[PDB]
Amino acid sequence: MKVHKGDTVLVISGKDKGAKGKVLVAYPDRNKVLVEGVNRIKKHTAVSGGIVTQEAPIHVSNVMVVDSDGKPTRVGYRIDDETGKKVRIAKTNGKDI
RNA sequence: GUCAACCGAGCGUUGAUCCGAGGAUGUCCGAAUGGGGAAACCCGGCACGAGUGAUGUCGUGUCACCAGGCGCUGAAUAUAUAGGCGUCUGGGGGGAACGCGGGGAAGUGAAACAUCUCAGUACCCGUAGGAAGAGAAAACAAAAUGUGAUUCCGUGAGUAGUGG
RNA sequence: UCCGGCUCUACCUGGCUGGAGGGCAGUGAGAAAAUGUUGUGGUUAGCGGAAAUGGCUUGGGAUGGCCUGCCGUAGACGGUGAGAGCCCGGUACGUGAAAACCCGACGUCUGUCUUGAUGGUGUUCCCGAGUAGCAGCGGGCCCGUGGAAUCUGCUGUGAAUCUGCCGGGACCACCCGGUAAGCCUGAAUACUUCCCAGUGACCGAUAGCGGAUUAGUACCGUGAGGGAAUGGUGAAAAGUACCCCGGGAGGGGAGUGAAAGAGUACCUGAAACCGUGCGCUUACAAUCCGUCAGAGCCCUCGACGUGUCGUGGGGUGAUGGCGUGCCU
RNA sequence: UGCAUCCGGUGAAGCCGCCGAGUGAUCGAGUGGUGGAGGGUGUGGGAGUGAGAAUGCAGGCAUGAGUAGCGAUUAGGCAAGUGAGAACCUUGCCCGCCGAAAGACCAAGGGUUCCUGGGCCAGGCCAGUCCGCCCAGGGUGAGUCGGGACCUAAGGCGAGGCCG
Ligand SMILES: [Mg+2]
Ligand SMILES: [Mg+2]
Ligand SMILES: [Mg+2]
Ligand SMILES: [Mg+2]
Ligand SMILES: [Mg+2]
Ligand SMILES: [Mg+2]
Ligand SMILES: [Mg+2]
Ligand SMILES: [Mg+2]
Ligand SMILES: [Mg+2]
Ligand SMILES: [Mg+2]
Ligand SMILES: [Mg+2]
Ligand SMILES: [Mg+2]
Ligand SMILES: [Mg+2]
Ligand SMILES: [Mg+2]
Ligand SMILES: [Mg+2]
Ligand SMILES: [Mg+2]
Ligand SMILES: [Mg+2]
Ligand SMILES: [Mg+2]
Ligand SMILES: [Mg+2]
Ligand SMILES: [Mg+2]
Ligand SMILES: [Mg+2]
Ligand SMILES: [Mg+2]
Ligand SMILES: [Mg+2]
Ligand SMILES: [Mg+2]
Ligand SMILES: [Mg+2]
Ligand SMILES: [Mg+2]
Ligand SMILES: [Mg+2]
Ligand SMILES: [Mg+2]
Ligand SMILES: [Mg+2]
Ligand SMILES: [Mg+2]
Ligand SMILES: [Mg+2]
Ligand SMILES: [Mg+2]
Ligand SMILES: [Mg+2]
Ligand SMILES: [Mg+2]
Ligand SMILES: [Mg+2]
Ligand SMILES: [Mg+2]
Ligand SMILES: [Mg+2]
Ligand SMILES: [Mg+2]
Ligand SMILES: [Mg+2]
Ligand SMILES: [Mg+2]
Ligand SMILES: [Mg+2]
Ligand SMILES: [Mg+2]
Ligand SMILES: [Mg+2]
Ligand SMILES: [Mg+2]
Ligand SMILES: [Mg+2]
Ligand SMILES: [Mg+2]
Ligand SMILES: [Mg+2]
Ligand SMILES: [Mg+2]
Ligand SMILES: [Mg+2]
Ligand SMILES: [Mg+2]
Ligand SMILES: [Mg+2]
Ligand SMILES: [Mg+2]
Ligand SMILES: [Mg+2]
Ligand SMILES: [Mg+2]
Ligand SMILES: [Mg+2]
Ligand SMILES: [Mg+2]
Ligand SMILES: [Mg+2]
Ligand SMILES: [Mg+2]
Ligand SMILES: [Mg+2]
Ligand SMILES: [Mg+2]
Ligand SMILES: [Mg+2]
Ligand SMILES: [Mg+2]
Ligand SMILES: [Mg+2]
Ligand SMILES: [Mg+2]
Ligand SMILES: [Mg+2]
Numbered sequence: 001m002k003v004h005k006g007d008t009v010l011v012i013s014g015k016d017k018g019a020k021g022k023v024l025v026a027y028p029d030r031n032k033v034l035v036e037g038v039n040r041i042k043k044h045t046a047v048s049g050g051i052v053t054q055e056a057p058i059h060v061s062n063v064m065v066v067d068s069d070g071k072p073t074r075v076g077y078r079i080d081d082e083t084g085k086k087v088r089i090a091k092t093n094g095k096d097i
Numbered sequence: 098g099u100c101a102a103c104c105g106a107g108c109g110u111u112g113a114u115c116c117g118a119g120g121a122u123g124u125c126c127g128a129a130u131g132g133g134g135a136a137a138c139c140c141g142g143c144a145c146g147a148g149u150g151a152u153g154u155c156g157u158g159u160c161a162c163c164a165g166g167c168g169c170u171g172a173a174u175a176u177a178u179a180g181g182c183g184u185c186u187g188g189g190g191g192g193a194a195c196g197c198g199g200g201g202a203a204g205u206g207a208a209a210c211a212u213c214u215c216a217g218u219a220c221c222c223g224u225a226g227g228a229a230g231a232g233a234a235a236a237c238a239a240a241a242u243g244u245g246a247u248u249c250c251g252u253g254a255g256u257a258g259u260g261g
Numbered sequence: 262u263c264c265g266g267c268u269c270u271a272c273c274u275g276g277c278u279g280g281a282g283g284g285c286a287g288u289g290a291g292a293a294a295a296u297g298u299u300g301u302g303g304u305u306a307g308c309g310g311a312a313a314u315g316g317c318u319u320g321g322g323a324u325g326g327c328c329u330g331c332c333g334u335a336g337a338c339g340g341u342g343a344g345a346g347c348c349c350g351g352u353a354c355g356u357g358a359a360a361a362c363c364c365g366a367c368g369u370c371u372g373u374c375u376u377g378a379u380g381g382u383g384u385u386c387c388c389g390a391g392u393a394g395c396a397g398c399g400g401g402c403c404c405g406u407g408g409a410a411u412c413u414g415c416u417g418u419g420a421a422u423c424u425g426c427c428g429g430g431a432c433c434a435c436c437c438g439g440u441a442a443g444c445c446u447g448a449a450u451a452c453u454u455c456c457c458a459g460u461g462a463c464c465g466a467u468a469g470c471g472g473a474u475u476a477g478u479a480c481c482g483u484g485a486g487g488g489a490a491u492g493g494u495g496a497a498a499a500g501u502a503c504c505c506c507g508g509g510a511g512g513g514g515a516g517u518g519a520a521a522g523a524g525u526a527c528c529u530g531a532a533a534c535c536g537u538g539c540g541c542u543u544a545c546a547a548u549c550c551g552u553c554a555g556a557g558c559c560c561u562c563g564a565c566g567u568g569u570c571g572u573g574g575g576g577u578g579a580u581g582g583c584g585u586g587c588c589u
Numbered sequence: 590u591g592c593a594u595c596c597g598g599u600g601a602a603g604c605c606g607c608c609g610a611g612u613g614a615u616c617g618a619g620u621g622g623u624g625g626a627g628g629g630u631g632u633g634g635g636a637g638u639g640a641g642a643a644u645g646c647a648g649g650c651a652u653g654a655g656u657a658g659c660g661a662u663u664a665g666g667c668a669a670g671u672g673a674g675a676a677c678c679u680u681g682c683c684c685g686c687c688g689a690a691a692g693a694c695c696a697a698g699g700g701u702u703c704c705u706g707g708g709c710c711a712g713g714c715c716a717g718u719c720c721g722c723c724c725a726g727g728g729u730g731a732g733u734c735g736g737g738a739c740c741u742a743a744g745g746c747g748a749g750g751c752c753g
Contacts, residue, residue: 001349011314012348
């Protein structure tokens with residue numbers, strides 16, 4: 001779905017614009033992803049209970065994958081004649097990911 | 098799956114969940130169809146297996162009504178029939194409207210009111226279908242040596258007519 | 262074309278049925294049952310599907326404002342922190358089904374018939390009966406007995422079969438035109454509980470279906486039946502750690518957040534309504550509660566000094582003139 | 590709705606004020622404070638288009654007013670305990686009342702109102718530690734009692750049948 005677990009994504013819209021991070025969990029039922037080190041929020045818990053800062057999810061539409069050349073890019077798909085596997089495309093240059 | 102989260106356990110690179118096709122599973126009531134009954138609950142007959150010292154006990158199946166046939170039987174009785182069985186195939190109930198068909202009213206208008214109107218409308222009932230119904234003139238027409246099944250549109254026309 | 266057997270037997274002429282071969286067509290309303298299958302046809306679900314991190318500004322957050330460049334056979338649509346074709350779902354376009362199912366042909370196999378068919382000169386028991394029509398009684402055709410055809414039918418009656426019938430709007434003659442009492446047969450048409458895709462000068466929570474929410478629920482009625490009210494925190498739960506008052510509820514701080522006069526009784530929060538405070542009025546006053554005058558006090562503003570003028574204001578209103586709400 | 594297309598997060602609509610202007614219904618590229626997402630000049634077009642009345646409808650809030658009433662004829666006082674608070678609850682002492690009930694069992698009926706534990710917003714016509722409140726847990730043990738295995742009345746259903 002152009003955004004998977006463990007990828008490298010760059011935030012487009014949001015207070016923590018321009019940061020980088022990994023993908024921890026995807027909420028495809030809600031299309032809302034969670035990225036460590038981005039969109040840092042605070043929380044209050046009363047069980048041991050303190051001001052625990054936790055990571056909140058973002059809409060995937062506000063994030064995108066960054067190519068190895070440090071250039072964020074859309075995603076494209078191919079069908080591998082060798083095995084028929086649908087792979088990623090660095091849309092600007094169409095490499096493999 | 099959701100409320101709803103949450104955990105807790107956990108599942109996946111061999112491809113788990115997710116979607117689609119076919120299949121199996123489907124307790125009980127419910128046309129209910131083994132009998133009965135206050136629905137979701139009581140009570141049996143028959144055939145095969147199993148366990149107990151045996152019974153007790155267990156599972157599985159089958160067991161309505163009507164219609165139409167088939168085989169067997171046959172009461173008054175003599176022939177034969179009714180009835181009696183047993184077996185195959187159908188139907189049984191539900192569903193918004195539409196269609197057909199059997200039946201079918203008053204409020205109302207008439208400035209009252211019966212004829213009349215309201216109207217063969219509402220409603221009830223029995224049918225099928227995806228449509229139905231109607232359908233190949235015993236029809237019209239009017240001297241033309243004309244039309245040529247049914248059905249549905251717009252006309253013809255609120256005209257000919259009908260009506261205390 | 263041929264073969265056989267018949268019209269109670271065997272031998273010319275005449276009238277039928279059965280078998281070898283061109284038909285009639287067939288899942289058919291006019292013969293019945295069987296014999297089996299190919300469209301990138303569609304349906305059931307799917308795949309790809311272009312082109313800005315572009316930069317700066319306000320900005321919480323940009324899709325926004327400005328500047329460039331973008332692609333488009335795709336600038337319908339939805340979402341993302343505010344108006345997004347160049348961010349995602351996706352849009353044109355392309356593509357695709359192992360299996361099953363609805364609509365389209367094609368070689369096993371089946372029936373029939375060519376004992377039947379087409380064209381030419383004269384004399385002698387069949388083709389819809391309790392039916393057509395009739396007397397009475399009623400019904401449907403615009404037609405209510407009216408002068409009343411045609412149709413149907415309840416009861417009694419009841420016909421001809423070709424020089425037969427029935428219709429031609431009472432009814433009759435010549436002629437004029439079409440076969441009743443048996444049967445079936447697609448297309449044009451009506452409808453939508455159900456599904457899909459699209460659209461609306463249709464509503465936007467007292468509207469709109471009764472029902473955007475546990476709704477045909479709560480509830481009412483024993484019954485048939487009736488039948489409600491009740492949407493929005495935030496972009497995201499980040500739903501108020503911790504401290505203090507109090508038993509808690511409730512509340513005040515602290516933090517979250519752009520905002521907590523967004524705190525879950527949660528957008529906006531009006532009016533009736535009930536308060537606090539402030540300025541002024543009111544305890545000799547007879548009444549649709551105002552209007553016209555109108556001093557005083559309060560505050561406001563400019564020319565001008567301590568308050569007086571000035572084409573002065575707003576609030577109050579002491580007192581007096583007039584004054585009998587509104588709709589029917 | 591149509592439009593040249595614009596207005597606006599440098600604050601739209603909406604709300605509450607103020608100012609000025611039109612003879613009116615109003616208007617203001619007119620603004621101050623809340624609000625934080627849409628409005629729309631002009632010219633047409635179409636309307637569920639303008640509310641005070643209808644003993645209108647639905648919702649909210651008024652007043653009579655902190656007034657009437659707090660639901661019997663049996664009736665209490667007090668000690669101590671719990672608790673923040675104690676007439677109203679727990680324990681104790683006395684008093685009173687029913688005692689063919691105002692006691693004890695069932696049927697019909699209701700269905701967790703039974704017991705234990707916790708808390709008192711909401712409910713109890715007041716407070717309430719209490720409750721028939723709410724929250725959690727527990728609780729119903731039958732060959733011999735009762736309803737089916739049995740039979741039947743009134744009556745209901747009813748194969749065939751009769752009539753419609
Ligand atoms: Mg399947
Ligand atoms: Mg299937
Ligand atoms: Mg099974
Ligand atoms: Mg039964
Ligand atoms: Mg049965
Ligand atoms: Mg038979
Ligand atoms: Mg006999
Ligand atoms: Mg049937
Ligand atoms: Mg009348
Ligand atoms: Mg009249
Ligand atoms: Mg009438
Ligand atoms: Mg009529
Ligand atoms: Mg059919
Ligand atoms: Mg037909
Ligand atoms: Mg006409
Ligand atoms: Mg795709
Ligand atoms: Mg900026
Ligand atoms: Mg832009
Ligand atoms: Mg612009
Ligand atoms: Mg668009
Ligand atoms: Mg948009
Ligand atoms: Mg997007
Ligand atoms: Mg008449
Ligand atoms: Mg006549
Ligand atoms: Mg004829
Ligand atoms: Mg016929
Ligand atoms: Mg048709
Ligand atoms: Mg509203
Ligand atoms: Mg009831
Ligand atoms: Mg802050
Ligand atoms: Mg409120
Ligand atoms: Mg609000
Ligand atoms: Mg005063
Ligand atoms: Mg005085
Ligand atoms: Mg006087
Ligand atoms: Mg007065
Ligand atoms: Mg006066
Ligand atoms: Mg006076
Ligand atoms: Mg703003
Ligand atoms: Mg503002
Ligand atoms: Mg403004
Ligand atoms: Mg706002
Ligand atoms: Mg607007
Ligand atoms: Mg216009
Ligand atoms: Mg206009
Ligand atoms: Mg109106
Ligand atoms: Mg009003
Ligand atoms: Mg009025
Ligand atoms: Mg009124
Ligand atoms: Mg009152
Ligand atoms: Mg009093
Ligand atoms: Mg009193
Ligand atoms: Mg009482
Ligand atoms: Mg006490
Ligand atoms: Mg006594
Ligand atoms: Mg007694
Ligand atoms: Mg006694
Ligand atoms: Mg009882
Ligand atoms: Mg009971
Ligand atoms: Mg108790
Ligand atoms: Mg307790
Ligand atoms: Mg309490
Ligand atoms: Mg109460
Ligand atoms: Mg409880
Ligand atoms: Mg019977």
